[PDB]
Amino acid sequence: YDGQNCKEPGNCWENKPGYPEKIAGSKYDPKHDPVELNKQEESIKAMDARNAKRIAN
Amino acid sequence: YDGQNCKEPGNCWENKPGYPEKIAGSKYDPKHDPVELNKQEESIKAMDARNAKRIAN
Amino acid sequence: DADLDKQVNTAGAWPIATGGYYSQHNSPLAQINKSNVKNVKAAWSFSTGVLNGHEGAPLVIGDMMYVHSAFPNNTYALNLNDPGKIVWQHKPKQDASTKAVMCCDVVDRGLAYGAGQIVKKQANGHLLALDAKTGKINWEVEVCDPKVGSTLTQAPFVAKDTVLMGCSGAELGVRGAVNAFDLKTGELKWRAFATGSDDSVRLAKDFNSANPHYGQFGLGTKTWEGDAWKIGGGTNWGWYAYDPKLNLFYYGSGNPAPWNETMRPGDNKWTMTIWGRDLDTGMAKWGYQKTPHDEWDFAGVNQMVLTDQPVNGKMTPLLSHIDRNGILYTLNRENGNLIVAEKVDPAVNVFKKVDLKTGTPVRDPEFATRMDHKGTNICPSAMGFHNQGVDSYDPESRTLYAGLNHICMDWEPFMLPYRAGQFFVGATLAMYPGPNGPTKKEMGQIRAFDLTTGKAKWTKWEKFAAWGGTLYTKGGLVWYATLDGYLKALDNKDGKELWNFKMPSGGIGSPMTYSFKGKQYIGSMYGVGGWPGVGLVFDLTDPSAGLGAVGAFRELQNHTQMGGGLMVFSL
Amino acid sequence: DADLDKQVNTAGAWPIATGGYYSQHNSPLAQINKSNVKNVKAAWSFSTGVLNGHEGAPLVIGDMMYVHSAFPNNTYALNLNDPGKIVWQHKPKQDASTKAVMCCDVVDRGLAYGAGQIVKKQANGHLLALDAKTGKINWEVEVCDPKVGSTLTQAPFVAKDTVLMGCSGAELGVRGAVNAFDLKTGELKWRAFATGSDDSVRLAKDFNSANPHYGQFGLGTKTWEGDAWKIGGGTNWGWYAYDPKLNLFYYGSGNPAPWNETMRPGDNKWTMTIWGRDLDTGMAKWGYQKTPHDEWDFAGVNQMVLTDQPVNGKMTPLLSHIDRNGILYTLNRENGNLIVAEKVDPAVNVFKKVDLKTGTPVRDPEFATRMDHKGTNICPSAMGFHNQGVDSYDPESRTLYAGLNHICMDWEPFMLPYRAGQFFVGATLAMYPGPNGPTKKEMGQIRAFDLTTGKAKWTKWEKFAAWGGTLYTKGGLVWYATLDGYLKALDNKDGKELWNFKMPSGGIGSPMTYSFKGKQYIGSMYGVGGWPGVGLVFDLTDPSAGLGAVGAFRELQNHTQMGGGLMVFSL
Ligand SMILES: O=C(O)c1cc(C(=O)O)c2c(n1)C(=O)C(=O)c1cc(C(=O)O)[nH]c1-2
């Protein structure tokens, strides 16, 4: 993996020898919790609502 | 009470007009708990004991 | 806005943290020069009453000076006619738990000014506009949410009627974004994320039309596995630059999360990217990813310096930038064309070089990072060969005076889960001096560069990293503060030290200058902290603590203690 | 001891906080003088990394300088060859609860030196002797118990082979006592209380034989009702003086507790007393009670200044002292004969005067305090017309330059119980500027006195109280720091201000001086606090809070913020 072999323009990542092409199912599977992954989006939604409410008044 | 009337040398205190000569039993009685009054003495005794065992070593 | 422009065009004023829209951080004031600098002495001083790292520098508008502290982010206004009197002050009330989610000390890089207002933020995510004369609050809005690990540290940036602000928190998996607010009302105009769909990233129809090999559409999700981009980092907490003529603002997006590269296969776009965006729509005209699939925490948020110089015999509008990865970049700021990509020091070993044709770094496997492996002698370290410092440019000799770090590292990642509000790093580090110092112990350098060739002119070594940056003044002087507590002035021709003064504590901001009643003054914050001072600031002894910084800076506490204030100097 | 005497006789050294055994706080160094003081500039600076009030001043022994901070009481040793390097430091680990029993900010008035050791205390009551060269602890002992409200703030005093140390805490009913320890082992030699039996107070057989009317035996208990003397205060937290020839040391005992005068009828001896004790045995040779039955918290711990001047054409061994009660006292330090007792300012109204024959103040009932009554326009206020400041004396013109306070008050007591470890004040105050300031707003004065007549020569008014004191140098200069942040130098002849510099924060200590490599340096701590700054330091807004100080100093925060450090100046 020298960064010079690109599948398509702007996408040149390759797995290093000894590592999988996809980590899902592998021993490196992060197994992220969908609920935790969505907390930032929900936080921003609430926040934008509070801001809009302030500007209005 | 101008401080110039002394009962004996070095003791010139006088009660101010309208105030008791002795406060015990009056409405200005502090009613100090004798237990609390002795805590400093007890603290010093314990402290001096600890210092003594330090100089001992 | 027009008000800011007026101040910018007023001699002796300092209304912008980086010295101006082009962020050259220089000054035409030449009262103090090579011949008399030896006579410079302390004029007056001011304590903030706060400890921890004091980054950034004050602003000077008219007869007023505005000083800012570290968390809880206090603002003080002083009229230069009598520095002994505080005209007005704003002292925020913030929950102490805000500090628990700040990665690298509770720092604040400064205030901004526009439309007769002092634009100021708080670590807890609030952004405010205060009347410059009275301190009255005009508006206050929320920008970041500490509950999910998002905080504010960078200085806001004002251009036309827009305020640019970006949250920090990549070390906690915060998905980065540059937020734009109306200068007059505080209303959100738009938000441009660093990862995700092209819509959320806000890419123009002709995005990278001049360099399609940089990549164009769909990469914000395509270069990630699954929804990993949602907690993919890319926060921008550095500095901006702006070209009024092209109406384009520039900045760099940060590192991808977590630091454990094995947990996020893919180029991870668009983190580590130099952007060229339209100020009014936020649409990106061009974007160049400097470090595909980061493996070293080379957060690409460093200063963008705009200059106009002859390239190949023709005057060209350029953008220069020294990244954490140790590469000095110079691009055409109009289209994103890559012109220069040179190593700032030969010790850089993560890349054999950057290929100008492919536009990508030629990686050296010997210095990569990956699970179940401990990389050793990797240069630069995560602190980079350049961090948040603000450098200066001399338009006459066409030279950039860079404050660099000479630190390398050992690195090994580890698996860990993501929990909103908790750190999401996943790597254990050991940091130490680079191999090129005179006695192999030096970690700092002030190095002059030619931005069109990327070649160095001279070098001055420092015991500790040159964290704050440099200021250049027409008198032919290069000013900078050191972590051990000195403000120094160098001959811009050969880097010879001509003057210095021992401040109360180390400085981690860059010096500024201004004139009052025909007299030139140099100002510098003091109060050590930031990443280099975490060990000293939080009483850490574990060498690997402080994300590996503690071990590297173990001696700092034998040279300085905490502080917080400003010192001003003059003839 | 012999080592201290050697340092005392070394030109350019500063081994004693008050400037010498006589505590005249002056210096023969004259490199800086009236003709060139305008050219003085900042040499270097040092931050302690701690906030709150920074009292006292550093010590200079040979090429070494020793700096101390406020709580947690850190000690830093610097080799003057390179102020940028901390040679060794001692950072105590103390329980944060210690701060809750400290009445007037978490201050520390300084270090002492003897037998090649740095004698240093900690707020929590421990006293230590550290090797001056390495910082190694030679011994450590307990002196005060915070659990009963006793803490340490004053500077230790070394004379011969003895270390003098007194606990603070009269506002919490602590019974005062001066403790004497062995300089080499830290072993307790003796202890002389301020109240109680003659044995506990330690009175010599010929106690006050020259002035029997001052009172003699049995007064430690007779001037109290019941066991009230067990919690009657008398703490000595001020400064000492010592006469080698007579082998007598001098100091003043503090105020009786509680502040509520109605709760403790009697002269309350021996609180508020000027003592003359034998160093080896601690037995008092004489003792003069300045304020019998205190009703205003005029803690009598202020500086004792020993001088030898002609009294009626006859050279006489004198002792001068300016008490909180606003009276300037000058006595014969051999026998205790009262020679002078004049008001430092005509605004003093608590006493019509001090009768030189009866030796007692002629009290004015109109300005007394008592239960069920609000006393108003009482001068001086509890902060006194003079507090912990250390003044200076010029041997040539025979003049004392005092830093005074011009503050008065309203006062009303209230009943309260005594509980070990809890405050035992019992009074509500309101403080404000005295009546004689030029614009009636000034609260500070620098006033020159003749100690044999008690008359003033000149006066310089200051916006805020002159809390730290003054330093006199043979070049004909009076140096002092102000609460608003300035270090100033005055022509000692007429008080004309010749030079000043705006430090980062207000100073509450007295300046010191020393020479290194043939150059004279002036040093001053900075960092506002102490009683005057409690409002600022603890963010108090209630004018009655801070025992009345908050309201009086409400404007201080508009001139300065907290800080903590040292600034050094020279030509
Ligand atoms: O990823 C981020 O959001 C983030 C934020 C910050 C910050 O805002 O202080 C730093 C960093 N990363 C870290 O990469 C870094 O090198 C750093 C140094 C400093 C500093 O002020 O000294 N902050 C930060």
Ligand SMILES: O=C(O)c1cc(C(=O)O)c2c(n1)C(=O)C(=O)c1cc(C(=O)O)[nH]c1-2
């Ligand atoms: O009665 C005592 O023990 C006691 C202690 C202290 C101290 O040690 O700080 C002060 C006082 N009283 C108080 O009377 C006073 O005026 C005062 C001012 C200060 C200061 O450092 O500014 N401390 C003290």
Ligand SMILES: [Ca+2]
């Ligand atoms: Ca980062």
Ligand SMILES: [Ca+2]
């Ligand atoms: Ca007191």
